[PDB]
């Protein structure tokens, strides 16, 4: 500077060059991602485990950048994560690709502000021709093949080895309880990891799955409303210790008598109030167990933080610390409570049957919890792509098969308009080309060959490429007729948010 005021870390040379090179580094984790891939990115964070992901949301939040230009796009990606599932990766690569292309424009003698203008135009034309790239759509949501084709694309983006089993499984276990036409819930479906057994041994269970073992008798009543307490037992009286063992012998008699009579009252209050399944995140003593056998209450030994969380969202529950008798107020929408072993481990099964506020669970079985964390990305994106809130989801060619189509239309259109805008319009075509480049890099061959041979076949609306040997040399595969389809809504928000993100960040200079 020339000033000992006016703080900036961007501006001049650093806006034009440094910001773009940073966007480029974030978006390197998604030029190995999106559709067919074998990439795995390991990220640690002292979580006492290894975290394996090929999803943009977890990669992005971990990674901190000190520049507003790179930091801003992470928010746009999260926005597309809420409204839709898979395509999160596609949002960041697009914004990041467009920005590399942009800097080249700046070099020649073109101004920032027209280039900014020409993207808004290109984004509007691309969306306008987008529902004219619908080639296939669902009509029934209770039919497993029409739902699974959609699911498949989310799963694919993760690994290209787990596409077939999972895509069937989710549709089988239901995310079609809701009409998905005005209303859909995604906190009334979780992905619940059950350690043990293989991942083709991943199963269908309906309603809330909690891993913790069941103790005592089990209920099967319809008067069973859920009461949730984080800690309702710790010993009803805490000791102090004066002989550094007990305080002391006659007192130890009283400490035990008072625990057993207070726990009797507490557990009888639960029994009376209509709570016939109590979730204990505390500790089940013999005294507490002895009471719940008499009243006929299903008892859940232990809970961890993760298990408590799903009860408060789904039930409309609160998790109260207790050692003084309480009453119902957690309530529940669950009538039936059954008991069924998943993984050869005793699992607590909640169910009721309804459309709205109805529950389902894609439950998994896996060798380790790491293998289950990646699978989970595939599955949670597969629930979030379901949300469109129609039953005709207007499926457009998944897998990046749309991308070349958009690019061809846009480059021609660019020619027609005059001025400086058009160059940005052309660049806007070559940003879509990012997706065919990343699929080429994993496939094992250069960019020149794939983009040219997709262009060669003209208007197709099917063409995209895999990880295969078919994916390399003739560089032609059918991803309309392989049942690789994605939803119109998922591609819409991906392109929309990414164009908005690229324009705001290209403006900065402070």
């Amino acid at each position: 500077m020339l000033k000992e005021g006016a703080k900036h870390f961007s501006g001049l040379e650093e806006a034009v060059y440094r910001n773009i090179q940073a966007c480029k580094e974030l978006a390197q984790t998604t030029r190995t991602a999106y559709g067919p891939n074998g990439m795995n990115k390991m990220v640690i964070n002292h979580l006492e485990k290894l975290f394996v992901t090929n999803d943009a949301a977890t990669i992005l939040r971990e990674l901190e950048v000190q520049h507003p230009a790179a930091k801003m796009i992470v928010m746009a990606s999260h926005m597309q994560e809420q409204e839709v599932g898979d395509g999160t990766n596609f949002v960041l690569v697009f914004a990041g690709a467009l920005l590399e292309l942009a800097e080249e424009l700046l070099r020649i003698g073109l101004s920032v502000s027209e280039v900014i203008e020409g993207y808004e135009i290109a984004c509007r034309k691309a969306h306008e021709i987008l529902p004219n790239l619908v080639c296939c759509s669902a009509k029934n949501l209770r039919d497993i093949d029409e739902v699974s084709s959609l699911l498949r694309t989310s799963i694919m983006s993760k690994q290209y080895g787990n596409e077939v089993f999972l895509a069937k499984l989710i549709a089988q276990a239901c995310v079609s309880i809701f009409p998905d036409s005005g209303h859909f819930n995604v906190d009334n479906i979780r992905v619940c990891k059950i350690l043990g057994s293989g991942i083709s041994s991943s199963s269908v269970l309906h309603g809330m799955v909690f891993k913790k073992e069941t103790e005592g008798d089990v209920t099967s009543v319809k008067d069973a409303k859920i009461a949730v307490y984080s800690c309702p037992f710790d010993g009803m009286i805490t000791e102090t210790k004066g002989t550094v063992l007990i305080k002391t012998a006659e007192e130890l008699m009283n400490f035990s008598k008072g625990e057993e009579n207070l726990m009797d009252a507490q557990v009888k209050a639960i029994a009376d109030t209509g709570a016939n399944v109590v979730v204990t995140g505390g500790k089940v003593a013999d005294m507490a167990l002895h009471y719940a056998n008499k009243y006929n209450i299903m008892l859940v030994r232990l809970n961890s933080k993760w298990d408590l969380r799903r009860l408060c969202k789904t039930v409309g529950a609160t998790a109260l610390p207790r050692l003084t008798p309480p009453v119902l107020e957690e309530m529940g929408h669950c009538d039936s409570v059954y008991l069924s072993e998943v993984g050869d481990t005793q699992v607590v099964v909640f169910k009721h049957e309804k459309e709205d506020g109805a529950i389902s669970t894609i439950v998994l079985r896996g060798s380790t919890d790491n293998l289950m964390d990646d699978i989970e990305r595939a599955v949670d994106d597969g629930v979030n792509t379901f949300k469109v809130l129609t039953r005709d989801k207007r499926l457009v060619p998944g897998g990046g098969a749309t991308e070349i189509e958009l690019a061809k239309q846009i480059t021609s259109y660019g020619e027609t308009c005059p001025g400086l805008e058009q160059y940005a319009i052309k660049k806007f075509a070559e940003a879509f080309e990012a997706i065919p480049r990343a699929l080429a890099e994993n496939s094992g061959v250069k960019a020149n060959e794939v983009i040219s041979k997709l262009y060669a076949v003209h208007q197709e609306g099917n063409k995209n490429v895999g990880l295969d040997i078919e994916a390399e040399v003739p560089a032609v595969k059918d991803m309309l007729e392989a049942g690789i389809l994605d939803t119109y809504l998922g591609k819409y928000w991906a392109i929309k948010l990414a164009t908005n993100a690229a324009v705001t960040v290209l403006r900065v200079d402070q």
Partner: protein, 514 residues
């Protein structure tokens, strides 16, 4: 330890010169949005000249000085503060060339004085009377918002801003200082801005759907608590014995009971039918028990509203704010013609609109709760201050650097005072102005000299304030398009620029101070 004489002037010019760069890429709609993470590390989205100076960390005396004078301008107009810096910078540059050849600072100053008088009289000549119609308010509203946001989102905020000013005529204020309540809504898009006539409330009832359409609303705004639970208190702290605290718990709960009862008696006395509703807005809780009883009677009771909601209600509705309930006549309570509850996002906002005796309008901005929703807040802020000026003055000129070339042309030709002493500052004053139009051309990608010769010639032939069409960066008549500027914008760049310049110009020492 001192910078004296040439060394003192050198420090000011160098700073102005780096700054100028920044706040030209904020100038007009063709300027560029800016963010700070350089102010504190957190993510701000801002596109106003004053505001951006505060958010950063300014240690430089010349940058700081420009920020202080900026503060006054920002209050009155909220536009032209992107411009303030630009005119200051060039104004210094001109001076510097003469000094370096061999010129005294003081002769420069004198010719500034002469410059300022003529320049202000030019505003008076050239001003064009406008109406006070909607159409004419639309065009002050749209161009000012266009400065502070995009073109797309700005056109949405244009509608909201203009209906408010028409309503403020009804109160017969010639100013704005109310109808500036900005309220935020939770949404998944920002391309909506809705106008709500009366007020909006942050939270509604904790029990949904009590009577979420109120035909005839009698608003008691209270603020005493109807919930205080079962907690053991005495004077609001623990006391030595259990029992002493308890005794107060009974009387406190009992007090609450009677106040909830007064709502039941009040509905008969004011209402008498369920053909009329009754509105309660409590800024403090209400028991879940109390809501069911009230609800069947056909009363909507609101819990956890703010102190800002309460003051606004008392003005607009004609309401009262009381620390009691009791049995009060409808003469005391305010009335609103309509109440509707609109649930959107994760938080539901009860609207209390079509108030009788209003003086507050709420401009309800929907947005995702990112920094973008803060960006339309500060765009909307200065767009209200803009259309305020149109009501202040009678006359609004076509802008886009149309005004500024016209004023510069008038100075170059004759000596305004007829002396050579004045003349040396006068050249300097005229070229300083030219920065504003030429630079709109620069952002766009159209050479700056070419627009100066054209724009100036077309003034001469016509007598039209021909301006710049921003997007091409080529000239066009600023009147038709709607790129306009108030009397107050072009007045306040002029006053700020002169005063700020003459105190930095007239330095001769800068010596450090504890």
């Amino acid at each position: 330890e001192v910078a004296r004489a040439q060394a003192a002037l050198a420090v000011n010019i160098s700073a102005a010169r780096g700054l100028q760069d920044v706040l030209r890429t904020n100038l007009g709609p063709k300027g560029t949005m800016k963010m700070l993470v350089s102010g504190a590390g957190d993510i701000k989205l801002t596109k106003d000249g004053n505001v951006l100076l505060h958010e950063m960390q300014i240690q430089h005396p010349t940058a700081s000085l420009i920020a202080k004078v900026a503060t006054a301008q920002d209050d009155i107009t909220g536009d032209g503060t992107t411009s303030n810096v630009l005119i200051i910078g060039e104004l210094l540059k001109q001076a510097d060339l003469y000094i370096s050849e061999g010129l005294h600072p003081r002769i420069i100053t004198e010719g500034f004085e002469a410059a300022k008088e003529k320049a202000l009289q030019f505003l008076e000549e050239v001003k064009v009377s406008r109406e006070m119609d909607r159409e004419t308010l639309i065009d002050v509203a749209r161009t000012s918002l266009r400065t502070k946001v995009h073109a797309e989102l700005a056109d949405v905020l244009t509608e909201a801003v203009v209906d408010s000013i028409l309503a403020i005529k009804k109160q017969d204020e010639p100013i704005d200082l109310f109808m500036i309540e900005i309220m935020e809504m939770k949404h998944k898009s920002e391309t909506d801005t809705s106008l709500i006539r009366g007020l909006v409330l942050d939270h509604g009832a904790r029990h949904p759907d009590m009577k979420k359409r109120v035909e005839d609303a009698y608003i008691l705004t209270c603020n005493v608590s109807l919930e205080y639970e079962k907690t053991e208190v005495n004077s609001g702290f623990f006391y030595k014995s259990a029992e002493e605290r308890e005794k107060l718990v009974k009387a406190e709960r009992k007090f609450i009971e009677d106040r909830v009862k007064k709502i039941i008696e009040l509905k008969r006395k004011v209402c008498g039918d369920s053909d009329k509703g009754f509105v309660v807005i409590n800024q403090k809780g209400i028991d879940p028990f109390s809501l069911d009883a009230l609800s069947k009677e056909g009363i909507v009771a609101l819990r956890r509203a703010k102190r800002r909601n309460m003051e606004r209600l008392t003005l607009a509705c004609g309401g009262v704010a009381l620390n009691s309930f009791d049995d009060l006549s409808p003469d005391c309570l305010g009335h609103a013609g309509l109440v509707y509850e609109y649930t959107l996002g994760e938080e539901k906002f009860t609207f209390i609109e079509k108030c009788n005796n209003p003086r507050s309008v709420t401009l309800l901005i929907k947005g995702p709760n990112k920094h973008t929703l803060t960006q339309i807040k500060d765009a909307v802020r200065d767009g209200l201050r803009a259309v305020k000026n149109a009501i202040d003055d009678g006359c609004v000129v076509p802008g886009a650097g149309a005004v500024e070339v016209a004023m510069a042309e008038a100075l170059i030709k004759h000596k305004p005072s007829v002396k050579g002493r004045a003349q040396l500052g006068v050249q300097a004053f005229a070229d300083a102005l030219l920065i504003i139009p030429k630079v709109l051309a620069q952002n766009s990608g159209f050479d700056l000299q070419e627009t100066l010769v054209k724009i100036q010639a077309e003034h001469s032939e016509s007598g039209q304030l021909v301006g710049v069409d921003l997007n091409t960066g080529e000239p066009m008549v600023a009147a038709e398009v709607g790129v306009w500027d108030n009397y107050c914008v072009k007045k306040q760049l002029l006053h700020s620029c002169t005063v700020i310049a003459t105190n930095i110009l007239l330095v001769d020492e800068i010596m450090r101070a504890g």
